[PDB]
Design an enzyme around this catalytic site. Structure first.
Site, mmCIF file in Angstrom:
data_model
loop_
_atom_site.group_PDB
_atom_site.id
_atom_site.type_symbol
_atom_site.label_atom_id
_atom_site.label_comp_id
_atom_site.label_asym_id
_atom_site.label_seq_id
_atom_site.Cartn_x
_atom_site.Cartn_y
_atom_site.Cartn_z
ATOM 1 N N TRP A 1 3.537 10.770 -6.722
ATOM 2 C CA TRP A 1 3.915 9.404 -7.057
ATOM 3 C C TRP A 1 3.857 9.212 -8.562
ATOM 4 O O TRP A 1 4.727 8.560 -9.132
ATOM 5 C CB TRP A 1 3.050 8.411 -6.315
ATOM 6 C CG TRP A 1 3.299 8.424 -4.883
ATOM 7 C CD1 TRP A 1 2.420 8.751 -3.912
ATOM 8 C CD2 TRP A 1 4.520 8.097 -4.234
ATOM 9 N NE1 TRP A 1 3.024 8.653 -2.673
ATOM 10 C CE2 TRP A 1 4.315 8.246 -2.849
ATOM 11 C CE3 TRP A 1 5.771 7.680 -4.686
ATOM 12 C CZ2 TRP A 1 5.304 7.994 -1.909
ATOM 13 C CZ3 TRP A 1 6.788 7.442 -3.734
ATOM 14 C CH2 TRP A 1 6.530 7.597 -2.359
ATOM 15 N N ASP B 1 -0.545 2.109 -10.577
ATOM 16 C CA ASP B 1 0.059 2.061 -9.256
ATOM 17 C C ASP B 1 -1.051 2.215 -8.247
ATOM 18 O O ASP B 1 -1.535 3.329 -8.022
ATOM 19 C CB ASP B 1 1.074 3.179 -9.091
ATOM 20 C CG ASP B 1 1.689 3.228 -7.688
ATOM 21 O OD1 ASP B 1 1.229 2.501 -6.775
ATOM 22 O OD2 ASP B 1 2.633 4.019 -7.498
ATOM 23 N N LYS C 1 0.293 -0.377 2.629
ATOM 24 C CA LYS C 1 -0.796 0.531 2.902
ATOM 25 C C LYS C 1 -2.099 -0.209 3.164
ATOM 26 O O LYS C 1 -2.787 0.042 4.161
ATOM 27 C CB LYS C 1 -0.892 1.514 1.753
ATOM 28 C CG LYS C 1 0.383 2.327 1.660
ATOM 29 C CD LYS C 1 0.389 3.300 0.529
ATOM 30 C CE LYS C 1 1.741 3.946 0.483
ATOM 31 N NZ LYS C 1 1.707 5.114 -0.439
HETATM 32 C C1 LIG Z 1 0.677 5.571 -5.047
HETATM 33 C C2 LIG Z 1 1.983 5.252 -4.373
HETATM 34 N N1 LIG Z 1 3.016 4.970 -5.170
HETATM 35 C C3 LIG Z 1 4.242 4.701 -4.736
HETATM 36 C C4 LIG Z 1 4.553 4.642 -3.390
HETATM 37 C C5 LIG Z 1 5.971 4.306 -2.998
HETATM 38 O O1 LIG Z 1 6.073 3.032 -2.374
HETATM 39 P P1 LIG Z 1 7.556 2.562 -2.009
HETATM 40 O O2 LIG Z 1 8.163 3.614 -1.118
HETATM 41 O O3 LIG Z 1 7.371 1.207 -1.342
HETATM 42 O O4 LIG Z 1 8.104 2.530 -3.412
HETATM 43 C C6 LIG Z 1 3.508 4.895 -2.386
HETATM 44 C C7 LIG Z 1 3.867 4.869 -0.957
HETATM 45 O O5 LIG Z 1 3.066 5.259 -0.137
HETATM 46 C C8 LIG Z 1 2.151 5.233 -2.896
HETATM 47 O O6 LIG Z 1 1.088 5.503 -2.069
HETATM 48 CL CL LIG Z 2 0.782 11.559 -5.136
#
Ligand SMILES: Cc1ncc(COP(=O)(O)O)c(C=O)c1O
Ligand SMILES: [Cl-]
Ligand SMILES: Cc1ncc(COP(=O)(O)O)c(C=O)c1O
Ligand SMILES: [Cl-]
Lengths: 348, 349
Positions: free
Chosen positions: B96, B162, B186
């Site tokens: 992420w 994030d 989540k």
């Molecule tokens: C740390 C983190 N960032 C980003 C995301 C992406 O979220 P989305 O698919 O709603 O952008 C997630 C999804 O589980 C996550 O756990």
């Molecule tokens: Cl990750």
């Protein structure tokens, strides 16, 4: 009697079917609990597309996409994706102006036609230049009550915000190159925005596009490059299933042209009120009318009495003023007729 | 049925039930999905939802709360567009974080001051935050690799984080963060809304280039309803906060989560069919990754199919790490964690 402009009335079946907040076929788990990477959710995405395709008679070569962020976000995305060098727009009202002001922020926009002069009461004559990268319209101008009811022949790819009048009648998809619509008016609940896009038009822009704003990426990942608005999408599935159950868009139109016919007739005969828009250009979804000469009075008088008599969400936009009766698909003949009598009995 | 799904995930029953508003929100008589976002009914809920969020997480004055569509993934773009004037710095602690970086890189000059790539994102790397960069971005809990930064960081440059995977999972000093964002799906509520807590002071410092719809300042000015928001998803957030408050707030939440994680990490360690992938020090309390030990004893089917049979869902790991992953967010109960413990134990051949 809900004449709300969006979010708006919804067929009861569709609200009830959303008993999947309680148990979706997980088994046992809420639709709001299930993974979008689950085969159970994937099927629904395919199923919703298949149905949309069936209901709207979408030919091969078009892709269906579900996005969060509303139509307002799409104002930007169409520009970033399809405005290479130059784009042209039709300014028929507030939403159209919003679309333009966004487009103008990304590249050069030429407004080929505008109904601004006479306060957006009419749909202006226009000529679509064949050398621009794309042409954008706003089929139904939700705030003013004007609408372009015939599908347009462009030479350049056509792009259309149908938020207010998508799925309100049958259309020739083949004329449109990119259609988009916030769900919240005719398609479903708020929180999802629909994009039916002719993938062929896409990769023609000079290079500058963020991953999350790139139609090509979303398409690649079946509208699940990231986490989609499952629950809202599910309203769309149900709503499509309803449309189909009740004879599809052909019957829908019948009910809508009748609803709009009766309502316009009332405004015309009743002489407390006066409709604001040119007959020829009248919207079938959003019906605007004002007090007649004058102030007889709008004030309180038509409004409070309407409220009492159970009519909600008919107060107009500030700019046009007066009233507006949003009569989307889910709005019944009975309700329109309840508002007809309300107007009629108010006649003094 | 024991749901270790990674997002969307388990949700408190009260919260799914409360969402009887689909049937009848105030109105009167109308569904929540029918109500106008301009209605005084909805406007109260926005305000209430903010007030509660402010209360639960202890947000000091100066910080603005915002609900967006489009996921955290959209936020990857928006932070950069809104705060990356001349140069930004980021910390690559996993998938992420990488996705966040790649987007930012598409907007401007990004410096990756730290990366745990080398040992496949099993640890949280040492770093130094340059005082001359426009902002520092981190990804507090690395949802796929099971690492996490459990202590709140002191920047100098504005901090951006994030917290999709570990927001609202414990108390935190909001005052250290300049912009927090987290997909709801989540810990916060249902998919289809993405929360932003942002220190409005930091904003107007970028040269000049921002589309209206991507402009935090525009959304702030219009109390998060510049355009139509995701009514129903937002509602789930309102309820989830109500539930958190109801059960002793974030302090108690933390207690439950740290115990849940401890017990499960304790099983993984004692049980020697499986092995935890991450450095103990940096172990995530939200997302617990473990693999087969040595080897292939066998991950294959063997731990998986049996677990499925026993009712355990959504524990299959990401392709990159492989093995398994036990997402144990707020709504996951001590009972479930213990049911997975027993499954693992009894399976000890
Ligand atoms: C740390 C983190 N960032 C980003 C995301 C992406 O979220 P989305 O698919 O709603 O952008 C997630 C999804 O589980 C996550 O756990
Ligand atoms: Cl990750
Ligand atoms: C024709 C039209 N386009 C676009 C929009 C914008 O929708 P959203 O709130 O999803 O930005 C509206 C909202 O009413 C509309 O009527
Ligand atoms: Cl308009």
């Amino acid at each position: 009697h809900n004449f709300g402009a969006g979010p708006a009335a919804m067929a009861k079946e569709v609200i009830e079917a959303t008993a999947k907040a309680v148990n979706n076929f997980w088994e046992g788990l809420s639709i709001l609990e299930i993974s979008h990477r689950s085969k159970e959710w994937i099927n629904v995405m395919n199923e919703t597309k298949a149905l949309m395709k069936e209901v709207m008679d979408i030919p091969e070569g078009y892709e269906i996409l579900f996005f969060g962020g509303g139509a307002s976000l799409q104002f930007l995305m169409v520009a970033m994706n399809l405005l290479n060098k130059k784009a042209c727009y039709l300014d028929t009202g507030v939403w159209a102006s919003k679309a333009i002001k966004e487009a103008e922020n990304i590249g050069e926009v030429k407004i080929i036609g505008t109904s601004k002069d006479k306060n957006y009461t009419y749909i202006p004559e226009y000529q679509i230049p064949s050398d621009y990268d794309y042409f954008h319209i706003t089929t139904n101008n939700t705030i003013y009550g004007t609408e372009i009811r015939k599908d347009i022949e462009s030479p350049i790819p056509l792009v259309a915000d149908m938020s207010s009048d998508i799925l309100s009648k049958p259309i020739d998809i083949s004329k449109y190159s990119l259609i988009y619509a916030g769900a919240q008016k005719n398609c479903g609940a708020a929180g999802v925005t629909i994009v039916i896009i002719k993938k062929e038009i896409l990769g023609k822009v000079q290079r500058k596009i963020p991953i999350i704003l790139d139609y090509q990426v979303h398409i690649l990942n079946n509208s699940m490059y990231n986490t989609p608005p499952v629950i809202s999408i599910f309203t769309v599935n149900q709503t499509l299933k309803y449309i189909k159950k009740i004879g599809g868009l052909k019957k829908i139109q019948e009910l809508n042209e009748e609803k709009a016919r009766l309502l316009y007739a009332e405004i015309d005969r009743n002489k407390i009120f006066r409709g604001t828009v040119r007959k020829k250009d009248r919207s079938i979804m959003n019906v605007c009318f004002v007090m007649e000469e004058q102030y007889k009075q709008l004030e309180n008088e038509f409004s409070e009495y309407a409220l009492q008599k159970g009519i909600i969400g008919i107060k107009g936009h500030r700019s046009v003023g007066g009233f507006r009766a949003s009569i989307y698909n889910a709005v019944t003949i009975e309700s329109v007729q309840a508002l007809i009598k309300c107007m009629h009995d108010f006649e003094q």
